[PDB]
Amino acid sequence: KIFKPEELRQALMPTLEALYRQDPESLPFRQPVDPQLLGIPDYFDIVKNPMDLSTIKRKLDTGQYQEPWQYVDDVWLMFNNAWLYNRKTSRVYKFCSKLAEVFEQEIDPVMQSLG
């Protein structure tokens, strides 16, 4: 199966929008982590492949996904980075877990629809 750019965008953008609609839980994930500004300069020692919502949105808007699983992989890279870097008691970790619950719920019927 070949997926057209607008087909991926129409099917997947609502799932991304469901993540942005979570407050406060989307807030840590809206822009790329800036370790110096945020006071966490060890971040890139630990997270080798950063990912965030703004990057995923741009990739969806600019045809950088050819297959829905490439989009799913980037969302999960964002989640796995947050569970790797952050302590289990932290806001970012718990907010990541909430986003992963929302995403699992939204993405399943969409994958079924895409075939």
Ligand X SMILES: Cn1cc(-c2cc3c(cc2C(F)F)N(c2ccc4sc(=O)n(C)c4c2)CCC3)cn1
DSSP per residue over 14-83, as a string? HHHHHHHT-TTTTGGGSS---HHHHT-TTHHHH-SS---HHHHHHHHHTT--SSHHHHHHHHHHHHHHHH
Torsion angle defined by CA atoms of residues 92, 46, 67 and 56, in that order, rounded to the nearest 10 degrees: 50
- Show contacts with ligand X in window 1-60 (CB under 6 A): 24, 27-29, 33, 38, 40
65, 71, 85, 103: which one binds ligand X (CB under 6 A): 85
77 binds ligand X (CB under 6 A): no
86 binds ligand X (CB under 6 A): yes
For ligand X, which stretch binds (CB under 6 A), given 4-12, 14-22, 63-71, 86-94? Answer: 86-94
Query: Count of residues binding ligand X (CB under 6 A)?
Result: 13
Binding interface with ligand X (CB under 6 A): 24, 27-29, 33, 38, 40, 82, 85-86, 91-92, 95
